[PDB]
Amino acid sequence: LLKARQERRLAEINREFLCDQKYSDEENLPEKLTAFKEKYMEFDLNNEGEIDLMSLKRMMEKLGVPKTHLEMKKMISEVTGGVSDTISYRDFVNMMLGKRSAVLKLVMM
Ligand SMILES: [Zn+2]
Ligand SMILES: [Zn+2]
């Protein structure tokens, strides 16, 4: 019942993202955030609730996509601007909505 607590917190974060000025130009934000929340939760999150190297690795093996230690560390820092070793839901939403196309995003679709 951890993944229900994780869902609820992301649901609340979406309530914030629905009003954040940063995304107020987005059309169909409710359906976008719902889609992003669903996708983020497909990852085995660490226990702050962020995607770390381990979760990224497990997703890569899930998707049948080969990535090296260093390609993965770079996929993360590309998405977090080098600020952090893990991808938070915020960074994940910024990636999904950004026009810059990160390797992690390309790998999703
Ligand atoms: Zn609209
Ligand atoms: Zn709608």
Swiss-Prot record:
Alphabetical keyword list: Acetylation, Actin-binding, Calcium, Cell membrane, Cell projection, Cytoplasm, Cytoskeleton, Membrane, Metal-binding, Phosphoprotein, Repeat
Domain EF-hand: 31-66, 67-101
TM stretches of this protein: none
Domain of life: Eukaryota
GO cellular component terms, A-Z: actin cytoskeleton; cytoplasm; extracellular exosome; focal adhesion; ruffle membrane
A single MF term (Gene Ontology): actin filament binding
Membrane topology: Peripheral membrane protein
Record: residues binding Ca(2+): D44, N46, E48, E50
GO BP annotations listed: actin filament bundle assembly; ruffle assembly
Intracellular or extracellular location(s): Cytoplasm, Cytoskeleton; Cell projection, Ruffle membrane
Primary role: Actin-binding protein that promotes actin bundling. May neither bind calcium nor depend on calcium for function.
Subunit record text: Homodimer (Potential). Monomer.
Protein name as catalogued: Allograft inflammatory factor 1-like
Source organism (scientific name): Homo sapiens
Gene that this sequence comes from: AIF1L
Part of the whole protein covered: 17 to 125 of 150
